[PDB]
Design a protein around this ligand. Sequence first.
Ligand code: FMN
Ligand code: FMN
Lengths: 312, 312
Amino acid sequence: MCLKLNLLDHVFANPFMNAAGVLCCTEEDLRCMTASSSGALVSKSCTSAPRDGNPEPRYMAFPLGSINSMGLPNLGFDFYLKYASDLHDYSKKPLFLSISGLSVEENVAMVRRLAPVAQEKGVLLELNLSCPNVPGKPQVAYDFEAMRTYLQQVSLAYGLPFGVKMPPYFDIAHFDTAAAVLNEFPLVKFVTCVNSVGNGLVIDAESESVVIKPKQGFGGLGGKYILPTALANVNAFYRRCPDKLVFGCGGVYSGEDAFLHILAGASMVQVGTALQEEGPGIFTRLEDELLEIMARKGYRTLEEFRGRVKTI
Amino acid sequence: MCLKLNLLDHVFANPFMNAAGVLCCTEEDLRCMTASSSGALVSKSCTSAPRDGNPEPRYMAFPLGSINSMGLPNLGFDFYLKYASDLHDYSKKPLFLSISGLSVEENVAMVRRLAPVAQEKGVLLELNLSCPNVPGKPQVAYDFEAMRTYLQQVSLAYGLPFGVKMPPYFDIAHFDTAAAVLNEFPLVKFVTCVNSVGNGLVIDAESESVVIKPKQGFGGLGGKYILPTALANVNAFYRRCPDKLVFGCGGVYSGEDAFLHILAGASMVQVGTALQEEGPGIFTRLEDELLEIMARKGYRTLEEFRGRVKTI
Ligand SMILES: Cc1cc2nc3c(=O)[nH]c(=O)nc-3n(C[C@H](O)[C@H](O)[C@H](O)COP(=O)(O)O)c2cc1C
Ligand SMILES: Cc1cc2nc3c(=O)[nH]c(=O)nc-3n(C[C@H](O)[C@H](O)[C@H](O)COP(=O)(O)O)c2cc1C
């Protein structure tokens, strides 16, 4: 038994990949992810120009997960585009390129240049509408009219299939509205749920201090803290977007957590905090653990249980 | 060294109280909370008429917290008003009465009748604008115009100091807007941050099923999952509402957790999931643990460290 699957006209050895931003900023990082046993990889969310990002310390991990305010430190779109066009070995695994412009115009500029490389190489766009860490830049997908504008303009400029990295929602009406906006756009072929639970605050009791420097300590949460939130979002969008794929992201540390994401509706399963903490060895463990659970339950394929979470 | 507080023209032996909804639905529950070592208690969020609530199972707890979709089961406003008027021993500790009408009209109806009892007895209103569990009723305070309408109408009909139970927010722009709305209302004297992290989804791996029955398993999250979210909201509103009090709620299991809430700006500290799981003995433990931390740090009163979280 193997975990191989086909999605978006690509073949994947297994459903696992890094979450955008983790182990994917430099050429070294991307080569490392490519050498790993992951089924795919995604690059660091990029901007038109290189960015230093927010002041350090800007990432901290704890038993229950992580907090960060990276601020989109990245080598610039030119680099990630070059990686996709010239450097990536597509024989190894598919590549997603994440973009996170600070305006609709910036995203449009990037996708116009990405299009020919997508046409030639088959790199897949993940449009980030949920960066919660750039000062003065609210999460785009929390403003439904802004989200519609971004998707209209990107759809028109790109003209090719793409996906969207979504923030978590916490309100049924918001699931309804957000999914309806996404459903307006036939080029949106996948929906990645979720980005960090935004603007949490970790405080150290001994020092009586916040643990990250940017934004007075306020940063995106990932890891164990967010698994039920992530599962809810995966399932909410799976139910509401029956003609799209949902990629699960949030709180994956084990094959069991991945199994839950897939039960909720996930096609691919992304790994952030746990990968940052454990390193790329995690991918062999996740594959082994997922296969073990499947074997115990008598499941032979991912399709046998994807989206088959039971209700009472 | 002492945990005493004097706020809202009341005296509190310590900052601890139940979170609304936990151990506070029946007369038995309220007498139990009154007999406990807590500094105060709050009644179950009530509606004009009694409610059975959502179908069971509707509460489930786990190592990292709880999920619920109770659906405002309550004995009805008449009962809680009678409790405040005739039954509560105010010589023991202050009482808060939580209301959660399903419309602005229902809330107005209740506060008109509460006002003379508040005037006579000193019962304190907590207005719930963040119930995430009634099917078809989105969280009021996620709609800023609805929130303003509710606060305008309740302010006019009630005419007395009250507080508001707020949902967690996850974006800086939302903290900014929400706090600005609250600041329009001089009668809002306290802000309780936070209600449950709404519409999470816990799935049991063995049974492949959601763990609660209502809303296809979607329920409010509390406990360890939500502490950094709760701290962020407490601090965000503490910073933005310098002329109001902030009550902390979310993820409190220990005196250390309470210490963090207080550093973030909390006056009272409410305990939900941990109280539901441990029972009212938790209050003596929380008091001992908070006093221990204060002793180690040389703090003699809560005011010496309230809101004194350090940034980098
Ligand atoms: C260090 C750090 C950097 C991240 N950078 C990005 C980013 O560039 N783009 C993006 O869409 N998400 C980014 N994320 C969010 C993750 O992709 C993921 O959505 C989140 O961490 C939740 O998954 P987890 O619980 O496995 O950590 C970042 C997260 C962290 C921890
Ligand atoms: C069983 C259950 C019932 C609740 N009922 C109410 C309610 O009636 N009104 C309210 O404002 N919050 C209610 N809550 C939310 C809690 O007051 C609290 O905001 C939440 O549980 C987060 O705190 P915690 O992490 O200590 O559990 C309820 C929570 C649970 C666990």
